[PDB]
Amino acid sequence: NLCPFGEVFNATRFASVYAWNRKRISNCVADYSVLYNSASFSTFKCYGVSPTKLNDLCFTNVYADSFVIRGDEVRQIAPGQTGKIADYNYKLPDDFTGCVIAWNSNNLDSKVGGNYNYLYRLFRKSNLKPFERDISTEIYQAGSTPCNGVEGFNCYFPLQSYGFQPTNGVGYQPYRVVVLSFELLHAPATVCGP
Amino acid sequence: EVQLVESGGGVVQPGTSPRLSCAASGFTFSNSGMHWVRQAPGKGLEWVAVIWYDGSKKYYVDSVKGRFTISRDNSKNTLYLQMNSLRAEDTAVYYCARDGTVAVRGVMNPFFDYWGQGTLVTVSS
Amino acid sequence: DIQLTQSPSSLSASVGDRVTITCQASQDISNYLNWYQQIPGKAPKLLIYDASNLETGVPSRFSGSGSGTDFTFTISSLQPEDIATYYCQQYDNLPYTFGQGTKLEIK
Ligand SMILES: *[C@@H]1O[C@H](CO)[C@@H](O[C@@H]2O[C@H](CO)[C@@H](O)[C@H](O)[C@H]2NC(C)=O)[C@H](O)[C@H]1NC(C)=O
């Protein structure tokens, strides 16, 4: 079968940071080969299962989250790491049992004239719980003098655009992050290598 | 090849509104607002005011709210600040610094990366 | 309403000594803070943005860390050049107060 990873790797579209797709794969053999051999991977960090032994473990469910984030802040996608991403829009469980892959992709997202297409969550009322989607548009409400659905001194739109340019630098420039999560359940295991 | 030039200060009498103007050397100026900070003569520095992405938001210091008017001429790629009124505490040096995170549509540069030069605005009669 | 407070407010370390200055902020500030290099009558420029990374151009000796409500800024081997004042500022909440200031001296 050899279920492809290109559906989540080489797809031209990417939910910015919060509409991140949650694609589950089943009844296949990943083979985890191209994931390790490729030398273009900026970051390849795994927790728990060692990188070499992935093919030897037969799980039952595998999730492949995908998105893009500021290049400098890629480190924030890790267990037990707080900041302005994990704390507001996409948090990972402390006892995580998966891998995270980060690519440097400038030629594909940083347009010469500038790109403002990709959105970014900044403001929220309460902290975020692990593995939850927070697609939202309601205007931020500071509290006292809560205004209404309008922009004012205390009231702000809880979204922003990265504003990518070709020559921002190593940081502040597109990165492409894919998080592979493995889960084992009482149901029979199906996903593993040769 | 980035730098910023300020001017429009000096001996200023009370009740006047001199034009404190600063301009940029070269970049996508229209896509990056800025801020103005004030350096007390020997104490420290707090602020002056803010200018947003498309001249939309105009925030000021609470202590001096409603007095200063800060505007931007995008065509000239310059920023102007006027002085509606003065007290004895406005004897500082004004710096104007660019932005690029949590200040403008599009995060490009780290907050307060360059600054540049200064203008002395001591007020007396 | 944000209030900043730098504990030391004055240092005098040896040329080859490691100086670990600190910055404390009220409420929560998350991961938005910067440190500055105020030489008398000069632009403060920048060393560390987000309190976790050094801007491209500053010497690699300096470093920073911290989160939540507390941050630390470490200088490894300060040369006689590094005798400027240092300020810590947050930029998260619309009122972005500016740190008090810490005069650096030589023993
Ligand atoms: C996505 O596209 C890239 C480039 O077209 C593929 O890169 C592969 O890299 C391997 C070595 O790592 C080489 O065989 C080729 O450069 C590419 N393979 C093929 C078959 O073209 C990448 O493999 C694609 N994604 C996936 C999941 O295969």
Q: Return d(Cα C46, Cα C49) in angstroms, integer.
A: 8
C32 touches chain A (CB under 8 A): yes
Using DSSP, state whether A134 is helix, strand or coil.
coil
Domain segments of chain A: what residues? 1-113+166-194, 114-165
The answer to whether the beta carbons of residues A43 and A176 sit under 8 Å apart is: no
Q: Return d(Cα A40, Cα B52) in angstroms, integer.
A: 38
Task: Decide if C55 and B116 are in contact by the 8 Å CB cutoff.
Answer: no
Question: B4-118 — its CATH code?
Answer: 2.60.40.10
Residue owning tokens 């202590």: B63
- DSSP letter assigned to residue B39: E
Report the separation in Å between the CA atom of B35 and the middle of ligand 1, taken as the mean of its atom positions.
Answer: 46
* Mutation target among A118, A121, A162, A170 for the B interface, most CBs of B within 10 A: A162
Smallest CA–CA distance, residue B109 to chain A, in Å, is 7
A126 lines ligand 1 (CB under 6 A): no
C101 touches chain B (CB under 8 A): yes
Rg, chain A, Cα only: 18
**β-strands C19-25, C70-75 pairing:** antiparallel
Sort out which chain B residues have CB atoms less than 8 A from C34's CB and list them. Answer: 110-112
C93 touches chain A (CB under 8 A): no
Which tokens sit at A155?
Answer: 């009231």
Q: Return d(Cα A175, Cα B56) in angstroms, integer.
A: 30
Beta strands in A34-173 (DSSP E): 41-46, 61-70, 98-104, 119-121, 159-161
Burial class (CB in 10 A: 0-12, 13-18, 19+), C79: exposed
Atom number of ligand 1 nearest to Cα A40: 12
Q: Return d(Cα B39, Cα B22) in angstroms, integer.
A: 16
C31 touches chain A (CB under 8 A): yes
| Number of other CB atoms surrounding residue B55 within 10 Å | 14
Which tokens sit at B15?
Answer: 């009740």
Sign of CA dihedral A54, A71, C25, C63: positive
A108 lines ligand 1 (CB under 6 A): no
Domain count for chain C: 1
Sort out which chain C residues have CB atoms less than 8 A from A73's CB and list them. Answer: 50
**β-strands C10-13, C103-106 pairing:** parallel
Q: Which of C43, C91, C94 sits opposite B111 (nearest CB)?
A: C91
Rg, chain B, Cα only: 14
Domain segments of chain B: what residues? 4-118
A159 touches chain B (CB under 8 A): no
Which value in Å is the resolution of this experimental model? 4.1
Beta strands in chain C (DSSP E): 4-5, 10-13, 19-25, 33-38, 48-49, 53-54, 63-67, 70-75, 85-90, 103-106
Residue-range definition of the domain harbouring residue C43: 4-106
Using DSSP, state whether A24 is helix, strand or coil.
strand
* Beta bridge mates, A121: A159
* Beta bridge mates, B6: B22
Sort out which chain C residues have CB atoms less than 8 A from B118's CB and list them. Answer: 41, 43
Task: Decide if C43 and B112 are in contact by the 8 Å CB cutoff.
Answer: no
A143 lines ligand 1 (CB under 6 A): no
Q: Which positions ≥6 away from B119 have C-beta within 8 Å?
A: B6, B7, B8, B9, B10, B20, B22, B93, B94
* Mutation target among B111, B113, B114, B115 for the C interface, most CBs of C within 10 A: B111
| Nearest CA residue ID for atom 16, ligand 1 | A38
A12 lines ligand 1 (CB under 6 A): no
Q: Domain containing C56 — which CATH number?
A: 2.60.40.10
H-helix or E-strand containing B74? none
Pick left, alpha or beta for residue A150 (phi over 0 → left; psi -120 to 50 → alpha; otherwise beta).
beta
| Number of other CB atoms surrounding residue A146 within 10 Å | 12
| Number of other CB atoms surrounding residue C101 within 10 Å | 18
